[PDB]
């Protein structure tokens, strides 16, 4: 149904109890089926902003690979790899295999496990729960919700929770480009 050349936009509003506020937006340019381009700009009140960009390569129909490289004022900041796919589940809920990989020049490459669940707690919504567990102990825990009024545009609100940050509230804005 859809055709090549079209792109998708997605705003990201990061708000926290503290005065410090974070804002950014990510978009994916689909030109060909082989691979697609991606870019997410992260701006902040301070002068510590950055820009991450990469590409999305499809190795399998069930498992997809998306290389996301983080660029900064310097030559290079760091390159991370993300792996997502579709996993079956006994019940009605769905299981999404998440994979986080952090590669840098200073430190060594490491790929931590990621578990992303998505289902309807009851109402006609898409509750996305992201949990990160490690061999030692729990890594982090965050929740997310996906809802909308029309198919054209959509909105989602997810909050992160961990020892590092007390409580962060991020709301994504799904909106397809005009051209």
CA 11 from chain centre, in angstroms, equals 12
Are the beta carbons of 21 and 48 closer than 8 angstroms?
Answer: no
> Strand pairing of 22-29 and 7-16?
antiparallel
Are the beta carbons of 28 and 177 closer than 8 angstroms?
Answer: no
| Elucidation method | NMR
Residues 6 or more apart whose CB falls under 8 angstroms from that of 101 comprise 80, 81, 82, 83, 109, 110, 111, 112
Q: Show me where the domains of the chain are located.
A: 7-176
What class has domain 7-176? mainly beta
Reported as type and span, the H/E element at residue 154 is strand 154-161
In 75-107, which positions are buried (b, 16+ CB within 10 angstroms) versus exposed (e)?
Answer: eebbbbbbbebeeeeeeeebbbebbebeeeeee
């Amino acid at each position: 149904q859809d055709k090549p050349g079209s792109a998708k936009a997605g705003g990201w509003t990061t708000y926290n109890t503290d005065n410090t506020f974070k804002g950014g937006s990510y978009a994916k340019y689909v030109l060909s089926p082989n691979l697609a381009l991606k870019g997410e700009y992260e701006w902040n009140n301070s002068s510590l902003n950055s820009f991450k960009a990469g590409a999305e390569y499809v190795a399998t129909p069930y498992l997809k690979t998306e290389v996301m490289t983080e660029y900064n004022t310097d030559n290079t900041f760091r390159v991370t790899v993300v792996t997502e796919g579709r996993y079956p589940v006994d019940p009605n809920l769905e299981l999404f295999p998440g994979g986080w990989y952090t590669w840098n020049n200073s430190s060594l490459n490491k790929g931590a496990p990621y578990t992303r669940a998505e289902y309807k707690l009851t109402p006609d919504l898409k509750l996305l729960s992201q949990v990160v567990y490690n061999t030692d102990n729990t890594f982090k825990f965050d929740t997310g919700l996906e809802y909308k009024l029309s198919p054209n545009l959509k909105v989602k609100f997810e909050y992160g929770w961990n020892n590092s940050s007390l409580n962060e509230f991020t709301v994504q804005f799904e909106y397809d480009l005009s051209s």
